[PDB]
């Protein structure tokens, strides 16, 4: 199938924040591909990295890399190392990414030509896809996305186009996808944490019937971290859902460790420093504990990173999760429950309790793969009539 159907996408919006001060170049990112393999992600969303004199159309060149990020040969070296490790590279081409308006305020035709020419240039350079954010600020965005998708997909079927929106409205999303029907789109459709399990259920099912169960993306934002919208108690629950919904789950760097930009005083909400160990944030040593880092969470089976790796492994290998056949049945007020299946492979049952109270819930007995909370027998069959969920608990079960 398509490569972006086979696992999660990983957005690295800031190279210097992801790696450390001064090491924010393409050559340095080569040394993090092993870690990204451990997350079992199938594609990186990189950049933007092009020359962009802020709010100046004439002095913005989508075909030239800002020297602060490396050279074109550094980029080619990064592409080959990622290809040798089965990781694909998506290049973000949002033109005025250093200004307040991402698409400038003038010369819509010149800006669109810059993007169109950048598509053809970087496709010849060997990139696997592109991302364009802040689509709502682009006049006739639906038409431009159609022209850009045709060019990207006419070069090769294995090339992807990702559009991003701040919108959470369904008609505004459906009209952007109209002339495309193949565009992977990210939005704030699920951004509201306060929604109950019944409402999240309604959001997912209503979107899939309005889109005719077409392949889509699943995420809480077009660029932001999960902690920008969710409290800590809901992080594990939402990671179970995003990895088990029909489509491509898209995350931002740090989501795997529950990175919280507010936890680091002064850090930008958009590009916080990635916490590898206790030396990652030397500004305020007391602000970072070991349980907040990649090094510390990698030693903890109960950590959010260990759950991310387990769910990502299941998403990229089980055929029921790789293909988009999905049915969610009514099962309670604060419950979101659904089954995932494909032909005759192993089927998966997902039960999500969004509420603060224990709520009650196909074979009679199924084997529990994991839970978002400790204290259960993983690898010992449970039953789906006396199923009882603790607050904010999510269950993933197996049955043939």
């Amino acid at each position, epitope marked *: 199938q398509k490569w972006w159907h086979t696992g999660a996408l990983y957005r690295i919006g800031d190279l210097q924040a992801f790696q450390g*001060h001064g090491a924010g170049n393409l050559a340095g990112l080569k040394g993090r591909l092993d870690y990204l393999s451990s997350l079992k992600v199938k594609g990186l969303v990189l950049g933007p990295i092009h020359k962009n004199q802020k709010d100046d159309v004439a002095q913005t060149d989508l075909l030239q890399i800002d020297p602060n990020f490396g050279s074109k040969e550094d980029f080619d070296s990064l592409l080959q190392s990622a290809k040798k490790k089965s990781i694909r590279v998506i290049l973000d081409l949002t033109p005025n990414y250093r200004g307040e308006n991402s698409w400038f305020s003038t010369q819509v035709d010149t800006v669109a030509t810059k993007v169109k020419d950048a598509l053809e240039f970087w496709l010849q350079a060997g990139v696997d896809g592109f991302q364009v954010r802040d689509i709502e600020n682009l006049k006739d965005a639906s038409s431009f996305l159609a022209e850009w998708q045709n060019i990207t997909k006419g070069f090769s079927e294995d090339r992807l186009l990702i559009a991003g929106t701040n919108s959470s409205d369904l008609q505004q999303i459906l009209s952007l996808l109209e002339s495309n029907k193949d565009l992977l789109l990210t939005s704030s459709y699920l951004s509201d944490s306060g929604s109950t399990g019944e409402h999240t259920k309604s959001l997912v099912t209503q979107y899939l019937n309005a889109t005719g169960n077409r392949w889509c993306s699943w995420s809480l934002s077009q660029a932001r971290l999960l902690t920008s919208f969710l409290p800590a108690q809901l992080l594990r629950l939402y990671q179970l859902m995003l990895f088990t919904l029909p489509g491509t789950p898209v995350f931002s760097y740090g989501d795997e460790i529950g990175l919280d930009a507010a936890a680091l005083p*002064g850090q*930008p*909400m958009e590009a916080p420093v990635m916490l590898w160990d*206790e*030396s990652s944030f*030397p500004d*305020i*040593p007391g*602000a970072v504990s070991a349980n907040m880092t990649v090094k510390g969470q990698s030693e903890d089976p109960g950590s959010l990173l260990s759950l991310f790796r387990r769910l990502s492994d299941q998403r990229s290998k089980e055929r029921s999760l790789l293909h988009g056949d999905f049915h969610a049945f009514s099962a309670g007020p604060g419950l979101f429950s659904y089954i995932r299946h494909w032909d005759q492979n192993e089927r998966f049952l997902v039960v999500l309790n969004f509420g603060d109270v224990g709520l009650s819930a196909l074979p009679a007995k199924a084997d529990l793969l994991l839970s978002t909370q400790p204290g259960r027998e993983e690898g010992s069959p449970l039953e789906l009539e006396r199923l009882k969920l603790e607050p904010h608990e999510g269950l993933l079960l197996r049955f043939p």
Partner: antibody
Framework: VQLVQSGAEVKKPGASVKVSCKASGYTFTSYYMHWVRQAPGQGLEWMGIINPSGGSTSYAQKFQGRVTMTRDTSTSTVYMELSSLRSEDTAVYYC??????????????????WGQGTMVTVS | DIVMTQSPDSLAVSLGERATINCKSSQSVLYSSNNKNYLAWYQQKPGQPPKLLIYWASTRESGVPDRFSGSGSGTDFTLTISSLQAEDVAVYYCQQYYNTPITFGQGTRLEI
């Protein structure tokens, strides 16, 4: 290279006060801006931090809910606003620039450039 | 939150004599990663903002006379003045920046 704050202000209980802090002589968006207040004859108390490149803030819990820090990059000015003023808020309010370690690219929170100060008196 | 305690609260020392101010923190401010102590010393004269004297517990800011020196590690720190001079009458504060919130000492007054 200096920081110049607005003039002294007198306010009634329950009112709000907004102190400005204009920067000059350096790249404004590269240095974090902190606020420290000092009651007459008392010690120093750190209020919070604003980063001019993005506007993200972080306030001490003692002031969470009453303090708001904003920035204007065009005028290179930082604003601090305190609401629900009481008698304990009578103090001199300083804006201070956060140190930048050129060697390590880190910003440890000690203050090399201070503002003149602004006396706020509450009835 | 880290509490800073200075000692003494007031200090009288004649001219050209050794002045010693101590600062204790309820929690070690020694960062094991870079082996640095996140402590600073300030000097404040009446009607003026505090002025940064020492940081990293013992590194002196450029422009501060050689007589000022900072020492200590972990939880105990000392600001020492070799030979007291006339323009040194001020209140001296220590400040930790190991963690947030940033906290100061209560301050030591230095008179002749």
């Amino acid at each position: 290279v200096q920081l110049v704050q607005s003039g002294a202000e007198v306010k009634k209980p329950g009112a709000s006060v907004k102190v400005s802090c204009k920067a000059s002589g350096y790249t404004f968006t590269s240095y974090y801006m902190h606020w420290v207040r000092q009651a007459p004859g008392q010690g120093l108390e750190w209020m919070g931090i604003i980063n001019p490149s993005g506007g993200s803030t972080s306030y001490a819990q003692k002031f969470q809910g009453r303090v708001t820090m904003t920035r204007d990059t065009s005028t290179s000015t930082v604003y601090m606003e305190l609401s629900s003023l009481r008698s304990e808020d009578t103090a001199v309010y300083y804006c201070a620039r956060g140190y930048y370690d050129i060697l390590t690219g880190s910003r440890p929170i000690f203050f090399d450039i201070w503002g003149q100060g602004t006396m706020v008196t509450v009835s | 939150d880290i509490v800073m305690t200075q000692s003494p609260d007031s200090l009288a020392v004649s001219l050209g004599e050794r002045a010693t101010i101590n600062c204790k923190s309820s929690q070690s401010v020694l960062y094991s990663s870079n082996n640095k102590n996140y402590l600073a010393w300030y000097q404040q004269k009446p009607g003026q903002p505090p002025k940064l004297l020492i940081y990293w517990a013992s590194t002196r800011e450029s422009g501060v006379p050689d007589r000022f020196s900072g020492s200590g590690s972990g939880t105990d720190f000392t600001l020492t003045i070799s030979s007291l001079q006339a323009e040194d009458v001020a209140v001296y504060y220590c400040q930790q920046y190991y963690n947030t919130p940033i906290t100061f000492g209560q301050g030591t007054r230095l008179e002749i």
